[PDB]
């Protein structure tokens, strides 16, 4: 086969099943570029900081998870075509991505009004004038209380993407860099019944209401 990095990009683009196992230690690494090791794993790839065990070095874009709040990947970090992007598992978490803007990973318990207020301090948000449009990918867990995810007071457009059902399930989000400050996003989900294949995580047109 090709490199593990190539195998992940191919699985993403082909819509194949190839799971990702993240070492929890990655959450001690700040958002932005990160040198990791990829390893063979059962039905997928393990991403960690271990140089041994058939490890293949890769430089990725990384977005950690932090309990009770959000983390942000800035678009100025995004440069190298074909570089992979990952965030840590979504365990009831939300991910919001502006096309050409930041990516946010918001922990499950943070209320939508609270995390929107925190996001909105970002320069890209301050530049998003009321009554104007952006392309936005937004992913939340189906069956979670609306309080924790619903942005309909703020955004006009397509419904969010969802993972899971009945407030149960986990998701993986990653991406492939396509140019300066730009990525294509991909996702899969994990049920008590196993993991799905990769699929696109789509940007849709959203107008800022207020």
Residue numbers in the entry: 2 to 211
The authors write:
B. pseudomallei Burkholderia Lethal Factor 1 (BLF1) is a member of the CNF1-like deamidase toxin family which acts by targeting the site-specific deamidation of Gln339 of the eukaryotic initiation factor 4 A (eIF4A). eIF4A is a member of the DEAD-box superfamily and is an essential component in the translation initiation complex, supplying RNA helicase activity responsible for melting the secondary structures present in mRNA prior to translation. A mechanistic similarity between catalysis by the cysteine proteases and the glutamine deamidase activity of BLF1 and CNF1 has previously been suggested given the similar orientation of a Cys-His dyad in their respective active sites. Six of the conserved residues between these two toxins lie in their respective active sites, including a conserved L-S-G-C motif located on a short loop containing the putative cysteine nucleophile (BLF1: Cys94; CNF1: Cys866).
Analysis of the refined structure indicated that the sulfur had not been subject to the oxidation of its side chain, but the position of the sulfur atom of the cysteine side chain was otherwise unchanged. Furthermore, the multiple conformations of Ser92 that lie close to the active site in the partially oxidized structure were replaced by a single conformation. In this reduced BLF1 WT structure, the Sγ of Cys94 is 3.12 Å from the Nε2 of His106, consistent with a hydrogen bond between them. In WT BLF1 the cysteine at this position adopts a gauche+ conformation, whereas the conformation of Ser94 in the mutant is gauche–.
